[PDB]
């Protein structure tokens, strides 16, 4: 009569893995060390079946980098067919390949814990 664990195979996300205060401390220290860099969490969308997983979810992006530029990097890193559909969301909102800096994105979209959370999908918003 011993407790058997279930669901070892279901990977938790970053927020599920680490507590708020422990996440908040990571951003505090990193911002002090490298203040010209933006903390980002980039994970796969839950339902997603086409696009692959990456080994890392914690990332540092220089302030000057563009949203368009970040999408190309994330797209390149996953090694996809060029026709394959790729979208990158912040707070469940799709992003256009636009000219805005990571520092402007960070100001506008940061989570209370200090990270910006992004998720990548094959599913388009509309259509
Ligand atoms: Mg889950």
CA of 34 to the centre of ligand 1 (A): 31
Q: State the burial class of residue 117 (Cβ atoms within 10 Å of its Cβ: 0-12, 13-18, 19+).
A: buried
CA of 13 to the centre of ligand 1 (A): 7
Buried/exposed 66-90: b ≥16 CB within 10 Å, e otherwise: bbebbbeebbeeeeeeeeeebbbbb
Sorted by where each starts, the structural domains of the chain and their CATH numbers stand as 1-127 (3.10.20.90)
CA of 46 to the centre of ligand 1 (A): 6
Q: State the burial class of residue 120 (Cβ atoms within 10 Å of its Cβ: 0-12, 13-18, 19+).
A: buried
CA of 14 to the centre of ligand 1 (A): 10
CA of 45 to the centre of ligand 1 (A): 9
Q: Chain-centre distance of CA 44, in angstroms? A: 8
CA of 57 to the centre of ligand 1 (A): 15
CA of 16 to the centre of ligand 1 (A): 9
**Technique used to solve these coordinates:** X-ray
User: Around Cβ 48, how many Cβ atoms within 10 Å?
Assistant: 15
Report CA-CA distances (Å) from 18 to 13, 15, 34: 9, 6, 22
Q: Quick check: 35 and 106 in contact, CB under 8 A?
A: no
Strands lying side by side in the sheet with 116-121: 58-62, 37-44, 116-121, 87-90, 93-94
Instruction: Using DSSP, state whether 66 is helix, strand or coil.
Output: strand
The residue to which tokens 């707070």 are assigned? 91
């Amino acid at each position: 009569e011993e407790w058997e664990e279930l669901g070892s195979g279901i990977v938790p996300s970053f927020k599920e893995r680490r507590p708020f205060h422990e996440r908040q401390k990571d951003v505090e220290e990193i911002r002090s060390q490298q203040p010209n860099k933006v903390p980002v969490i980039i994970e796969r969308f839950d339902g997603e079946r086409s696009l692959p997983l990456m080994d890392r979810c914690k990332f540092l992006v220089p302030e000057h980098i563009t949203v368009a530029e970040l999408m190309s990097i994330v797209r390149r890193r996953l090694q996809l067919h060029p026709q394959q559909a790729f979208f990158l969301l912040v707070n469940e909102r799709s992003m256009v390949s636009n000219s805005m800096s990571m520092s402007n994105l960070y100001s506008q979209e940061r989570d209370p814990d200090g990270f910006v959370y992004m998720v990548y999908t094959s599913q388009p918003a509309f259509g």
